[PDB]
Write a protein that binds this ligand. Structure first.
Ligand SMILES: Cc1cc2nc3c(=O)[nH]c(=O)nc-3n(C[C@H](O)[C@H](O)[C@H](O)COP(=O)(O)OP(=O)(O)OC[C@H]3O[C@@H](n4cnc5c(N)ncnc54)[C@H](O)[C@@H]3O)c2cc1C
Ligand SMILES: Cc1cc2nc3c(=O)[nH]c(=O)nc-3n(C[C@H](O)[C@H](O)[C@H](O)COP(=O)(O)OP(=O)(O)OC[C@H]3O[C@@H](n4cnc5c(N)ncnc54)[C@H](O)[C@@H]3O)c2cc1C
Lengths: 622, 622
């Protein structure tokens, strides 16, 4: 029954969050155990085979900078690479990759399979062990049960999910996988409010039944970009293009005629296609993408045609488009409904506020998307390994990582939509960029021992280059009567009228970095342009960064002021009943986090501070 | 409900037999449809990751010579290659390959995914449609149902199987896959007797917890062999070795002490390890192999340590061996029990004798092993596509293919052991070799349109080379007083005493082919040694081949004499009651097949022939 070796941390579910948690825990020198249903599914993509995008590439970069694996399994599995918002400011760009599925799966499995201090095990779980608000050990299906000092759950969408097609349904975790039914009931016993969500995916087409000779082609950028701060372009496999098609009035007529057979007729947008037509009935054209699932299989994923209608309607819609006159379907589209926990009963370190040692990550946190689970799993594993070693935990803030924004929003949002990350959703966009993620996370990774020697050396060299470039550019001066100043005035507006300097010379918006590096002064730029772009970004954004920094420094006291979960707001005088109920329901962790809740005003926080001072629950508030 | 396109043949289950059936049906110019649970499992190996062996390589060669895929997916996925019985006669050699699992899976999937006239579909089946002893169409789970003129079942071990560990059990098709329960009941309604069998597999070890520094290594053959008659050695990936270890008295003591916890305490041999110790208690040493599952994963398959004991005993046995003092297990060992049909109610063309158009192949035919299913599936698909096109079927005999022997034995054996192919199990070993499989099957493949142009050209060139070599060796003559005969007599015993010839010169057993080719006469041999070995084999085995040929030619009349399944042997005078019951139970297809049944004597067949002549059910018997 009892396994004769105790472990530090046990992860349940090796999906997109479990793998990151296991890697983070093992790399931090703690004995890690990973339980999963079945192997060869590690790194499986059950949806659009794409990585990154607007708001998703930032999470990938954050995971990579802190010692992740998603950014490294994509450099050897991407069949198309593009940069989004390339023409706009550098703070908003993103990198999106159409990925070969098998190469990604194998990269993930091989990287995870050779990780020291970690062991994997293929078995389901059926219950957990808890006594005195402490979780210790998990129970498998055969009868063998383990013991550990910390447990992380990354079930995802397998918590008692049903596949829905048309008006019919059947049990299933996803297309071809079984459901984890009993664990849903066992967790329902725990003091966690549980709800249900539903999302769908479209069918798959056969590439050798589509006449691509009349379909428009789309390509990526000529210089293929990279995700990780370590690899280069020599690791990418061969490239393939994408095909673009549209719909026509016959498809809309068929959808409207057969709209009766649907469970519906809901997010604030339109995920399906019948929603697309009904919400906007005047539009008569839509864009559909066809992209290959890999460079060695002829299955085409159609993007933009997701629905929940029965099979006949699906076939008619597929067969009523240009270039799809005679098409075959290998995998029917379908939706799935799964359980989740409301993210208002766990600490910002992704630990349940009621149980000691229990952590949550992945889809069960009311989110969606590959990138939205890797960061959660990595942080959960980090905190679990810190706790098992008896050291204080860690959690990022809204001003240093998109992960902090994600956690804070999931804690104090209260909406019902699946959580999708967007660039504008964070209030510190101007500094929470992609190229500087390592510069703001790798030192923390090193302090907690999540970064090995190669990354440390690379970052030290990059920082040295940045500092030397800054100093050398600060060490130049020019005058209007300078011997070489004629050409400087020729191709620069507003010619020099007084003592000039490169640090001030570049302040003009029209000038760039490489242009200044090509000059009689301002000697040739450093060979590592990756470090060179940093100085340009800093010089262009210095004023806004300074303003935001002195803004952030002011809320630090409210950030530090913690509120224990045992607090009973009914024992506070001067607060309205609605505010009391709201604060009792949310149970924030800090006064600043409470202030971010909708419905609380500065008067409420002032009264709360007075009450805290009265009860002595705060050392000081300055 | 009804799919708007009728197909020629529908295969249910894309495993090891379904893929071959689909390829054979599609390559024969018939619209083929393949239903499966889930994709990315095509080509999965759920047991020892090895291909070929004694009696299994012959089936692989037969499949390859007739247009198969197993022999082509192994040349790009094998990590170790060896020849068994290399020192013995060429008629008994075999080729065995330790294979990388992922490369095999991807080769299979990519080869199957680009097959013209074939389409794949991911869906389970829940029932079949039959009227008036005819099967037309199958029903899926969602509700969509198809129509076809022929149906082939390749379920394998998913027909309502249970996983067993120790004294506990749970539903499962295998480690990580769901069971197909309702189809088992639906097939129970069909007039086919059903039974249950059980077989197990050992656990998996972690390669980075085993001290291989004190373990013996094993190697293959430097001159690499080849499976397919098309590829070469340039397609094989990098090679890896295998490790060898043993057991000791502590393991036996632990097994004996904890023998109580076992469902048992059965094939005529000992599949498990506790059986190994109990059946032969005097032996105190056993051989265990450790082989890598691939060149990119550190999971080690242990061969020779299969069992059904609980997990604690498994761990003790693993930890009580040299080099395994501190070992980890990633996948526990387990057994499975599954349903099957008794192979006495189907025609030799793998068609049920009662239903029209229904075919059986794979594990459901009471067999085991990868190679034992591919041939069955290929033949079933061939016959189904022939039937759907309204042409006479085909079935090999015992004298031209191991498939004929396999089918004949499964029809008229009556034992309970899982059927494993062995070289000595066939009575025509001397001609049913491996190197000549194409020479005896590719012409039939071409006649039925299973062979494309490349194989046809290669075989035509090879046959031309063989014929020219035969003629040129027949066109030589030597004399004792020959000018170059001094050396001939020097290195050959019994010097020439009369007119000599190479066709007679090579008749000496000590002489070889290459030695004769490197002589004053008998100019250098042809560059294609693959064709050169054929003449050596023919000249060495001519007498035995001639004897066996004139033997086989005599039973052809009994082979041709068919016996309809509607025959009622109770209406025959002069036959004993036991013989009547036996023949009614078996219901053979030919008088020769009936004679191969145990318990029938020549008197019975003579009386049967007399009765047939009386009733006029035979045109003639000569
Ligand atoms: C029908 C469908 C629709 C989708 N729609 C969208 C969409 O609209 N937008 C979008 O962004 N993404 C969508 N997706 C993708 C989805 O968000 C991701 O595929 C996935 O849910 C996120 O990964 P995860 O790690 O959070 O969960 P999963 O990948 O589901 O995690 C499950 C993994 O953990 C293992 N596991 C789980 N529970 C256990 C347990 N108890 N014991 C052991 N092992 C366990 C499983 O074996 C598996 O490896 C969709 C997917 C499907 C199938
Ligand atoms: C516990 C265990 C022990 C084993 N022991 C041995 C051993 O001792 N010796 C040995 O040689 N082999 C052993 N094996 C391997 C196995 O017995 C066979 O060697 C081999 O797997 C045969 O596979 P198959 O293709 O015939 O069928 P399977 O792999 O069992 O299934 C065939 C395929 O058809 C699909 N399918 C089935 N039903 C349907 C349906 N209704 N609709 C759609 N698709 C369907 C399945 O999903 C699968 O992909 C063992 C396997 C297990 C799990």
């Amino acid at each position: 029954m009892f396994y004769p070796d105790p472990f530090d941390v046990i992860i349940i579910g090796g999906g997109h969050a479990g793998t990151e948690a296991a890697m983070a825990a093992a790399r931090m020198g703690q004995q890690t155990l990973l339980l999963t249903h079945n192997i060869d599914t590690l790194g499986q993509m059950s949806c659009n085979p794409a990585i990154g995008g607007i708001g998703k590439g930032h999470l990938v970069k954050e995971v990579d900078a802190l010692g992740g694996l998603m950014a490294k399994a994509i450099d050897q599995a991407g069949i198309q690479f593009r940069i989004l918002n390339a023409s706009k400011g550098p703070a908003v760009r993103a990198t999106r990759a159409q990925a070969d599925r098998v190469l990604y799966r194998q990269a993930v499995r091989t990287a995870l399979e050779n990780q020291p201090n970690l062991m994997i095990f293929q078995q389901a779980v059926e219950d957990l062990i808890v006594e005195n608000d402490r979780v210790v050990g998990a129970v498998t299906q055969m009868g063998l049960k383990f013991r550990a000092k910390a447990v992380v759950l990354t079930v995802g969408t397998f918590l008692d999910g049903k596949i829905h097609i048309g008006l019919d349904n059947y049990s299933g975790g996803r297309a071809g996988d079984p459901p984890s039914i009993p664990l849903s009931r066992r967790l329902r016993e725990l003091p966690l409010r549980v709800g249900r969500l539903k999302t769908g995916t479209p069918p798959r087409i056969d590439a050798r039944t589509i006449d691509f000779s009349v379909l428009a082609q789309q390509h990526g950028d000529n210089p293929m970009p990279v995700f990780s701060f370590m690899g280069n372009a020599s690791q990418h496999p061969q490239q393939v293009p994408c095909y673009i098609t549209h719909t026509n009035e016959k498809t809309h007529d068929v959808i409207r005629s057969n709209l009766d057979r649907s469970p519906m007729y809901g997010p604030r947008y339109c995920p399906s296609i019948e929603d697309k037509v009904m919400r906007f009935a005047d539009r008569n054209q839509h864009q559909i993408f066809l992209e290959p699932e890999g460079l060695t299989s002829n299955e085409i994923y159609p993007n933009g045609i997701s629905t929940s209608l029965p099979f006949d309607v699906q076939m008619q819609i597929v067969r009523s488009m240009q270039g799809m006159e005679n098409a075959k379907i290998v995998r029917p589209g379908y939706a799935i409904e799964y359980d989740f926990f409301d993210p208002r009963d766990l600490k910002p370190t992704l630990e349940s506020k009621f149980i000691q040692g229990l952590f949550f990550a992945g889809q069960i946190n009311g989110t969606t998307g590959y990138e939205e689970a890797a960061a959660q799993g990595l942080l959960a594993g980090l905190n679990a390994a810190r706790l098992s070693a008896d050291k204080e935990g860690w959690a990022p803030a809204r001003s240093q990582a998109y992960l902090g924004v994600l956690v804070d929003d999931l804690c104090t949002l209260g909406t019902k939509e699946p959580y999708r990350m967007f660039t504008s959703r964070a209030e510190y966009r101007l500094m929470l960029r992609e190229d500087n993620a390592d510069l703001r996370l790798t030192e923390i990774g090193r302090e907690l021992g999540l970064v090995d020697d190669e990354r440390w050396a690379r970052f030290n060299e990059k920082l040295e280059n940045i500092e030397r470039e800054r100093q050398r550019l600060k060490s130049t001066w020019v005058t209007p009567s300078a011997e070489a100043a004629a050409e400087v005035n020729a191709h620069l507006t507003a010619p020099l009228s007084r003592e000039a300097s490169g640090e001030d010379l570049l302040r003009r918006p029209e000038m760039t970095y490489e242009k200044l590096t090509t000059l009689t002064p301002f000697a040739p730029a450093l060979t590592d342009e990756q470090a060179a772009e940093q100085v340009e970004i800093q010089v262009k954004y210095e004023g806004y960064i300074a303003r935001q920094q002195d803004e952030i420094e002011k809320q630090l006291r409210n950030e530090n002021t913690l509120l224990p979960a045992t607090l009973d707001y009914r024992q506070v005088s001067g607060l309205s009943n609605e505010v009391i109920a709201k604060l009792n329901d949310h149970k924030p962790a800090s006064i600043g986090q409470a202030s971010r809740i909708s419905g609380v005003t500065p008067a409420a926080i002032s009264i709360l501070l007075v009450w805290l001072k009265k009860q002595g629950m705060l050392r000081r508030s300055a």
